Ligand binder design. Sequence first.
Ligand code: 3RP
Length: 217
Amino acid sequence: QPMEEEEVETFAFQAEIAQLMSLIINTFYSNKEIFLRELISNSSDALDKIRYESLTDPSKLDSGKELHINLIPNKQDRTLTIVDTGIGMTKADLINNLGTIAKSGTKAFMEALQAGADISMIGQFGVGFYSAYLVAEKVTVITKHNDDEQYAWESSAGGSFTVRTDTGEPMGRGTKVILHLKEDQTEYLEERRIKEIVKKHSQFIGYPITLFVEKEL
Ligand SMILES: COc1cc(-c2cc(C)nc(N)n2)c(Cl)cc1Cl
């Protein structure tokens, strides 16, 4: 008689990814705003991909033709969400690409930081997503790929993440990254702050970026 039942899988992060997450979430950096640039960059890449695929197969856009990025601060939940209508991910994609397999860039980036590089370089190593943990204590990724169901990935950087089917609100296609912000990082929920960060770092993104200020009445 339960309203809902669903299987949740828990996976351990590959060792080097766990190491990087611990470094990022614990260490003091003075330029934490770069997380938003990195997430918008990932969305832009995902939008390029579905767009590329649609060139040879227009039906790839039956799940939605609009290619855009939405930013949604919710002060009541203390969350900031970045949403795109890009290519999205399968369950295998989440497990493979968000924790269990480390590319060489993970170790390389930590090496670069030890050698004196700046965290703002993180995107060049292909792991910019994890910069989310500069400002977030927990990150949830909800994703929908063509021909696949909607999944939710989640981690609070304990060395493990979970994956499950998401049945809440169906997306047409794309990815939502939900940042559950640290208590002292709530400035990134303010309109002025989000606007100035986008203006400074995401000028050359070639998709509409739209702010939706969320408040439950
Ligand atoms: C390249 O690495 C990553 C990419 C993504 C991603 C994938 C897709 C399809 N879209 C968006 N916005 N982001 C994520 Cl959620 C984590 C990592 Cl680690």
